[PDB]
Amino acid sequence: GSRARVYAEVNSLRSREYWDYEAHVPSWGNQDDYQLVRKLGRGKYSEVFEAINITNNERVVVKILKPVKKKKIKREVKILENLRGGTNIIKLIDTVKDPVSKTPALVFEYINNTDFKQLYQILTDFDIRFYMYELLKALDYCHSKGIMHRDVKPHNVMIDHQQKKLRLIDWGLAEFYHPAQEYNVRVASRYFKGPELLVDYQMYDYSLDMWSLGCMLASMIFRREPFFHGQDNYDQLVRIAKVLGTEELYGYLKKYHIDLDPHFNDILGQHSRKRWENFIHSENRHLVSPEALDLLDKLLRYDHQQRLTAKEAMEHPYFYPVVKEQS
């Protein structure tokens, strides 16, 4: 079938307890130590509040989990435990429960983020290189720990643009990678779904996250956010094929023995592969360089096996100015 080019066997080389999250027994502390200040957001399975730890006055966030998704709670908890101390990964401070209802919650460090819709409009060339390099550190770390994030998107990449801090958040869709395992393709936000998800190819790997990061890179350097703006999952693949080309799509499908949903017959059309330079104009030209386009071209590929790994991306010349500054 398909296997990851890096870190393919890393979970099988670790103790079973590392990846067998259904067997994980979290230590649940007392949520009563936290005073909720403000609701920050709400999703299908969780709500996040700004909070104060009343025993030490530290500001934190509390993510209250819709209880009874028990397996999924253990998964997120175990993944965060395994990622402890990872570079640019949101820090899990504690796992707590309401001591009466037993509803679980996760306590994270607080990041004073700048909303990406405002931020992306003011980023310089160097800013984009810097933040993408920092994001790559988090992905390389989690992939090396055997974990796919599966929901990389601007809302999950919190950036404090004053302190220059970046954290990859919301590990609720993340999974452990096991060679030959078939995964649910209902992951990621529509605009950040890799072609593999859109064509129902279940034997995917860490390279899914590299598609999503390529989409974010394109949106930043070209100032089109989101970059591929589908109206539904079918239209999402059409938007991708209008840039990457249809002949190239068909070669990918043939290589992996993938059959397209026949509804695509009515909507895909015929599209040449476009030059990345076609997206340059006066409003984004200062953010685009030959190195940026070369990197992007090596991320936004149909063939998940040919996309750069996070490490190879970090090694690309596009980041040399950042490396030089960090030394």
Least distance in angstroms from the C-beta of 78 to ligand A1IKB: 14
Is there a contact between 21 and 147 (Cβ–Cβ < 8 Å)?
no
Q: CA quadruple 177, 182, 188, 192: dihedral positive or negative?
A: positive
Both tokens of residue 173? 């869709």
Listed residue (124, 111, 189, 117) closest to 321, CA to CA: 124
Footprint (CB under 6 A) of ligand A1IKB, residues 296-325: none
Binding segment for ligand A1IKB among 123-131, 154-162, 268-276, 305-313 (CB under 6 A)?
154-162
Residue from 41, 99, 251, 269 in contact with ligand A1IKB (CB under 6 A): 41
Is there a contact between 304 and 2 (Cβ–Cβ < 8 Å)?
yes
Contacts of 39 (CB under 8 A, 6+ apart): 47, 48, 49
Known catalytic residue: 151? yes
> Is residue 214 a known part of a binding site?
no
Residue from 51, 79, 148, 169 in contact with ligand A1IKB (CB under 6 A): 169
Both tokens of residue 139? 């992905």
Tell me: does residue 78 bind ligand A1IKB (CB under 6 A).
no
* Residue 200: strand, helix, or coil: coil
- Residue 50 vs 297, nearer CB to ligand A1IKB: 50
Pairing of strands 29-30, 92-97: parallel
How many residues appear in the chain?
Answer: 327
Q: Which amino acid is at 312?
A: E
Alpha-carbon distances of 177 from 5, 11, 180, 319, rounded to whole Å = 12, 7, 9, 27
Angle at 34 between CA 28 and CA 35, to 5 degrees: 150
Tell me: does residue 182 bind ligand A1IKB (CB under 6 A).
no
Comparing every residue's Cβ against ligand A1IKB, the nearest one is 116
Least distance in angstroms from the C-beta of 39 to ligand A1IKB: 9
Question: Which one is catalytic: 20, 98, 125, 151?
Answer: 151
**Within its chain, how far is the Cα of 241 from the centroid?**
22
- Residue 26 vs 245, nearer CB to ligand A1IKB: 26
Binding segment for ligand A1IKB among 11-19, 115-123, 194-202, 277-285 (CB under 6 A)?
115-123
Q: Which residues of 256-275 are buried (b: 16+ CB within 10 A; e: fewer)?
A: beeeeeeebeeebeebeeee
> Is residue 323 a known part of a binding site?
no
- Residue 5 vs 91, nearer CB to ligand A1IKB: 91
- Residue 62 vs 249, nearer CB to ligand A1IKB: 62
> Is residue 61 a known part of a binding site?
no
Residue from 86, 154, 195, 214 in contact with ligand A1IKB (CB under 6 A): 154
The whole-angstrom separation of Cα 241 and Cα 310 is 24
Residue from 115, 200, 247, 325 in contact with ligand A1IKB (CB under 6 A): 115
Least distance in angstroms from the C-beta of 245 to ligand A1IKB: 30
Tell me: does residue 61 bind ligand A1IKB (CB under 6 A).
yes
Tell me: does residue 219 bind ligand A1IKB (CB under 6 A).
no
The whole-angstrom separation of Cα 174 and Cα 72 is 10
The count of residues interacting with ligand A1IKB (CB under 6 A) is: 22
The whole-angstrom separation of Cα 94 and Cα 205 is 29
Return the active site residues: 151
Please report, as ranges, the residues that interact with ligand A1IKB according to CB under 6 A.
40-41, 48, 61, 63, 90, 108, 110-111, 113-116, 119, 154-155, 157-159, 169-171
Binding-site members for ATP are: 40-48, 63
